[PDB]
Design a binder for this molecule. Sequence first.
Ligand SMILES: CNS(=O)(=O)c1ccc(-c2cccc3ncc(-c4cc(OC)c(OC)c(OC)c4)nc23)cc1
Length: 280
Amino acid sequence: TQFEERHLKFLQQLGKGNFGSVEMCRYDPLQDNTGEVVAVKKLQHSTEEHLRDFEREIEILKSLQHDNIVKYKGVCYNLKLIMEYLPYGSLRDYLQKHKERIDHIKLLQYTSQICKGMEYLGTKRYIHRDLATRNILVENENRVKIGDFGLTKVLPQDKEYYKVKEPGESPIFWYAPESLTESKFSVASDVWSFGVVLYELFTYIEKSKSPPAEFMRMIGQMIVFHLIELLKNNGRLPRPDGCPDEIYMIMTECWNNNVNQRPSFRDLALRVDQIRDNMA
Ligand SMILES: CNS(=O)(=O)c1ccc(-c2cccc3ncc(-c4cc(OC)c(OC)c(OC)c4)nc23)cc1
């Protein structure tokens, strides 16, 4: 689980997000082109503050072992996080690319896996804070994984929420109202954002239907102010084209202004699994 920098061969840039950057590399310590391909995450620019967040992120990933969470492999130290490489990339891109070939039953299979991954985080009192299809990865056609933990926090021992306000662009169109108004993040705000993930899936990532596109439409520098007002006024993302009522109702329940009335991830998984069965 200690990887030597000299043996990591760069192949391509996989993405940037939240001050981190990820590369596809081949780890080839025998220098004979037989090593495995791995994903390598590094800081875009290493502050001492950002370095300390990165170290906690590594600890979090390392503590997670679950079929629907990307596998930690080790570190390389300019500290680098080494992970398994998932060959189908981000669910956001995969879904868009194969939309004509992925049915509702398959979306619910992915939805179910995301819920189980999230329930597992919950058991460790981890709050993901960045649930979005762009952060979900595809291992194969039957299996997705939560694939990034850059914003993930551990709840204090004595509170059910964690207050945090970072510099940078926040993904406001996936945020719960209380995250926008009070900077409070909790299992319940992860549930809110999960409802946005579910919306993303059922729109098949159609560009004009993205959460920023739909909310901007509804609002017409103070964008956060008007987003807050819209949500307090029960403005919501619409039912996606083709989305059944019972699935849209899962979304609308995740999007409760009342924090304590949102479903649990365990109940989300049950409902999804039941609807899946009914469809099969
Ligand atoms: C969305 N946030 S991010 O861009 O910083 C990011 C990028 C990569 C990963 C990541 C973390 C751990 C394992 C990964 N395995 C494969 C791919 C991946 C593979 C792709 O191709 C097969 C691809 O398409 C170019 C892609 O685009 C985002 C990501 N990405 C992996 C996590 C976050």
